[PDB]
Amino acid sequence: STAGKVIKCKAAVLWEEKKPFSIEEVEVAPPKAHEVRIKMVATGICRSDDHVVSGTLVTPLPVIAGHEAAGIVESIGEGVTTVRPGDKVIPLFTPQCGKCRVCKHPEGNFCLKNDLSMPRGTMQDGTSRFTCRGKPIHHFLGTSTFSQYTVVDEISVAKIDAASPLEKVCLIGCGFSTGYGSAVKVAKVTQGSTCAVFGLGGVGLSVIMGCKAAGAARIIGVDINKDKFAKAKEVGATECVNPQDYKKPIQEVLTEMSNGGVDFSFEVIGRLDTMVTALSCCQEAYGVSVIVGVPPDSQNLSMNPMLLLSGRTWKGAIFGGFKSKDSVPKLVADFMAKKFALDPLITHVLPFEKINEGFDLLRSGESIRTILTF
Amino acid sequence: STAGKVIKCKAAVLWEEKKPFSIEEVEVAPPKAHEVRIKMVATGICRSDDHVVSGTLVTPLPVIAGHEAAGIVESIGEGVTTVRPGDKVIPLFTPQCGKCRVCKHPEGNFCLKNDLSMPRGTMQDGTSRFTCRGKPIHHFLGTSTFSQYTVVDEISVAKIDAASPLEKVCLIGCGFSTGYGSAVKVAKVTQGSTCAVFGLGGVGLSVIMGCKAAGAARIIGVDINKDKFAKAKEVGATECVNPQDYKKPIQEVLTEMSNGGVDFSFEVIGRLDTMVTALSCCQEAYGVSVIVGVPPDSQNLSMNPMLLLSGRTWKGAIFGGFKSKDSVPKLVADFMAKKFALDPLITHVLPFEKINEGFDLLRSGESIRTILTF
Numbered sequence: 001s002t003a004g005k006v007i008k009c010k011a012a013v014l015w016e017e018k019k020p021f022s023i024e025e026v027e028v029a030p031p032k033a034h035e036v037r038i039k040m041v042a043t044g045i046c047r048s049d050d051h052v053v054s055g056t057l058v059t060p061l062p063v064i065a066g067h068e069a070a071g072i073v074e075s076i077g078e079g080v081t082t083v084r085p086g087d088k089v090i091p092l093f094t095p096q097c098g099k100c101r102v103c104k105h106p107e108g109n110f111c112l113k114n115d116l117s118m119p120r121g122t123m124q125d126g127t128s129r130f131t132c133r134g135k136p137i138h139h140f141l142g143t144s145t146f147s148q149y150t151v152v153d154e155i156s157v158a159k160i161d162a163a164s165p166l167e168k169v170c171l172i173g174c175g176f177s178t179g180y181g182s183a184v185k186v187a188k189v190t191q192g193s194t195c196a197v198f199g200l201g202g203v204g205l206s207v208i209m210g211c212k213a214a215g216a217a218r219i220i221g222v223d224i225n226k227d228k229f230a231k232a233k234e235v236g237a238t239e240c241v242n243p244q245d246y247k248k249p250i251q252e253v254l255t256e257m258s259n260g261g262v263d264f265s266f267e268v269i270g271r272l273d274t275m276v277t278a279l280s281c282c283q284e285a286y287g288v289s290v291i292v293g294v295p296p297d298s299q300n301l302s303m304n305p306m307l308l309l310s311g312r313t314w315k316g317a318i319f320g321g322f323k324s325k326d327s328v329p330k331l332v333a334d335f336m337a338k339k340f341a342l343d344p345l346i347t348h349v350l351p352f353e354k355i356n357e358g359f360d361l362l363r364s365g366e367s368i369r370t371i372l373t374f
Numbered sequence: 375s376t377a378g379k380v381i382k383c384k385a386a387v388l389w390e391e392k393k394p395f396s397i398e399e400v401e402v403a404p405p406k407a408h409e410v411r412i413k414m415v416a417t418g419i420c421r422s423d424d425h426v427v428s429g430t431l432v433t434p435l436p437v438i439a440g441h442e443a444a445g446i447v448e449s450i451g452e453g454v455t456t457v458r459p460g461d462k463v464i465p466l467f468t469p470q471c472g473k474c475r476v477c478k479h480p481e482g483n484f485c486l487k488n489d490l491s492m493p494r495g496t497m498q499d500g501t502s503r504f505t506c507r508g509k510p511i512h513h514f515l516g517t518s519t520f521s522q523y524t525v526v527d528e529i530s531v532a533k534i535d536a537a538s539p540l541e542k543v544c545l546i547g548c549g550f551s552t553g554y555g556s557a558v559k560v561a562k563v564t565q566g567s568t569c570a571v572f573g574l575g576g577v578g579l580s581v582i583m584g585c586k587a588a589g590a591a592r593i594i595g596v597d598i599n600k601d602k603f604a605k606a607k608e609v610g611a612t613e614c615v616n617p618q619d620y621k622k623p624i625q626e627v628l629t630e631m632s633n634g635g636v637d638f639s640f641e642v643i644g645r646l647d648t649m650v651t652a653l654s655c656c657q658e659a660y661g662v663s664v665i666v667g668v669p670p671d672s673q674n675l676s677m678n679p680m681l682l683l684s685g686r687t688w689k690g691a692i693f694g695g696f697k698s699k700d701s702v703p704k705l706v707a708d709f710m711a712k713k714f715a716l717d718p719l720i721t722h723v724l725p726f727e728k729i730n731e732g733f734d735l736l737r738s739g740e741s742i743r744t745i746l747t748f
């Protein structure tokens with residue numbers, strides 16, 4: 001009943017940094033060629049969405065944020081072949097165009113069509129599908145999931161199992177897949193190894209899940225909020241440490257605990273200092289450190305390259321290294337077959353209209369993932 | 375006969391930084407338990423030896439430097455089982471104790487017994503075998519090859535083929551193995567790939583050798599000294615570029631040349647700026663950059679961690695990642711079987727007594743490797 005028509009719906013518009021979202025009516029244009037309009041069902045609150053608010057992650061404003069979500073296709077533009085109206089789908093904040101050198105590479109996943117490296121806040125064609133108060137509103141990472149309806153490019157959507165529970169599998173659109181893949185795919189954690197995970201939010205917990213799935217013998221969680229430790233242990237941490245409890249720097253503590261450094265470390269916070277600490281705490285000759293956290297915009301870290309010369313490997317990744325469109329449906333299928341759990345990540349559920357309360361919960365330290373329902 | 379006796383011999387002593395070596399008589403104690411005394415036959419001049427002179431690499435002075443060498447065992451201490459008097463040997467500046475966690479790890483080579491991380495300038499037992507003018511003289515990296523005789527720990531020497539030409543295979547003690555391994559073992563260069571090699575000295579040429587052996591399609595040499603380009607092409611470079619020729623930063627040039635970044639880059643100079651440039655010029659999603667150059671003491675680089683978050687891998691290594699005592703004899707065997715060439719690295723051969731002239735050749739840009747003969 002809405003195909004080819006502008007849809008008026010509610011969205012959470014961010015007009016200004018460091019302000020609450022405004023829940024108000026937007027106009028959502030119909031999809032153009034190779035675009036898909038999605039009726040959103042559930043969306044998670046990821047710290048990266050908060051980074052938009054805080055100016056940690058710079059993207060043009062005003063904006064409809066949201067990137068961790070699931071919904072049902074309302075209509076498809078001309079030439080769309082990979083989804084149909086009524087399909088369950090997860091928007092892909094990292095696209096998979098299938099054609100660029102990265103998409104063709106066996107390891108690569110950071111498709112050249114992404115809007116993360118140099119955000120413009122548009123569709124692939126450089127325009128916006130959103131109007132609010134008569135004004136154009138930017139997209140975010142090609143997804144913009146904080147809206148009852150969004151429009152995405154076909155390369156930024158994956159069809160998923162028709163029987164999928166969308167209020168759970170929305171987490172596969174960012175935080176679960178990111179953390180889990182960072183462990184299993186990017187670091188390639190080995191059986192019997194010792195891992196250190198810095199930051200015990202939704203993504204860090206998913207890292208722990210992956211380290212445990214990979215057979216790590218020890219998984220040391222690191223967080224300044226000791227309230228995060230119980231859940232970390234539930235999902236596989238063998239020990240947790242709070243840097244504030246120690247006189248010495250935590251890289252020294254972790255090196256001591258691991259009898260000379262850990263096999264694999266993960267920065268899952270977004271601080272320059274913890275990126276360097278996480279590198280330092282891995283064993284100097286054969287350790288591997290993976291950066292997952294998003295750093296403050298345009299800031300450089302300082303480090304001694306002797307940390308690498310001895311033999312350490314330092315890498316980072318977006319979305320756990322997963323080729324997004326290939327991997328998301330498989331991850332959903334695996335979830336359905338109980339190969340991993342998502343409930344440990346979900347601490348709060350709210351209606352979409354309570355988005356600002358959801359962000360308050362994240363900022364206070366109380367939540368892991370709040371799932372918003374439309 | 376000399377076994378069990380102090381040897382008085384000629385050595386090149388470095389009394390203080392930024393001075394010529396002093397060629398004079400030293401006393402070399404006999405080997406203690408698990409030590410080996412070696413009559414030197416040939417030693418190369420590696421830029422790392424010059425770093426000791428320039429204060430780029432801090433190690434206790436006064437010192438007998440030299441670490442890239444080959445000789446013949448004169449005598450063995452009690453308990454030595456791996457070499458005998460008369461054997462051809464290469465001192466190992468990275469030891470292989472076989473017992474530490476690094477030695478037991480499949481990918482580690484930076485044995486915990488090394489004297490590089492926190493240099494003490496002694497034998498494993500904390501003492502020196504060298505005196506000169508009544509004063510104790512420090513060792514360098516457990517090798518000290520700028521002497522007619524040295525004493526090394528058993529874990530810092532490998533037996534090699536009795537038919538080996540020592541005036542060539544001394545380069546397997548540092549520069550060749552480092553560069554070749556950095557390509558084939560540390561980076562794991564792939565067939566058909568594009569590589570960039572920063573620095574076209576003995577080590578960088580050996581990196582090129584390895585990239586070509588691994589089947590790279592393109593190997594771009596980068597040096598500010600265009601006189602290095604002809605030999606780089608001889609050993610496999612497909613193109614060479616001098617950053618001084620361009621208005622733009624060379625990472626931008628290399629990214630353009632490689633249609634979006636190289637597969638593998640190598641820093642083989644020892645500058646903070648070129649370490650960051652080399653990282654930046656590899657493809658952002660799947661590129662790998664290896665630091666080989668030795669940085670100036672205690673200096674930190676500055677970099678934006680988004681370079682890693684997109685998917686790059688950054689690593690470094692000592693001695694090409696090779697487990698030293700296992701690998702050196704095999705590399706010599708491979709050389710004797712014509713699997714690689716060493717002559718392209720050798721531009722000058724001088725008597726040991728001309729050590730200062732050999733260093734002047736390096737510093738002036740005129741040599742690759744000078745081999746000093748005893």
Ligand SMILES: NC(=O)c1ccc[n+]([C@@H]2O[C@H](COP(=O)([O-])OP(=O)([O-])OC[C@H]3O[C@@H](n4cnc5c(N)[nH+]cnc54)[C@H](O)[C@@H]3O)[C@@H](O)[C@H]2O)c1
Pocket residue numbers: 046047048051174175178198199200201202203204222223224225228243268269270271274291292293294295317318319320368683
């Ligand atoms: N690379 C990617 O594709 C990707 C995907 C998803 C999230 N992210 C980023 O990953 C990070 C974590 O996201 P999240 O799990 O949603 O966030 P979160 O829920 O805010 O978790 C971060 C955790 O870090 C803890 N923390 C804060 N400061 C420190 C400190 N100094 N030492 C130790 N712990 C500390 C904090 O208490 C919290 O539990 C954020 O920077 C995100 O932007 C990256």
Ligand SMILES: NC(=O)c1ccc[n+]([C@@H]2O[C@H](COP(=O)([O-])OP(=O)([O-])OC[C@H]3O[C@@H](n4cnc5c(N)[nH+]cnc54)[C@H](O)[C@@H]3O)[C@@H](O)[C@H]2O)c1
Pocket residue numbers: 309419420421422425548549552572573574575576577578596597598599602617642643644645648665666667668669691692693694739742
């Ligand atoms: N990691 C290891 O185990 C290991 C082993 C051996 C050598 N090294 C280091 O590797 C480096 C190279 O050693 P080497 O080959 O004997 O030295 P080298 O022969 O002096 O070669 C260095 C090359 O770098 C070139 N160069 C200098 N500045 C620049 C610049 N800004 N941009 C581009 N090219 C430049 C220079 O012209 C020369 O051809 C040194 O720092 C050594 O200390 C490390």
Ligand SMILES: [Zn+2]
Pocket residue numbers: 095096097098099100101102103111112113
């Ligand atoms: Zn692509």
Ligand SMILES: [Zn+2]
Pocket residue numbers: 046047048049067068174175
């Ligand atoms: Zn996210």
Ligand SMILES: [Zn+2]
Pocket residue numbers: 469470471472473474475476477485486487
């Ligand atoms: Zn060892």
Ligand SMILES: [Zn+2]
Pocket residue numbers: 420421422423441442548549
């Ligand atoms: Zn060397």
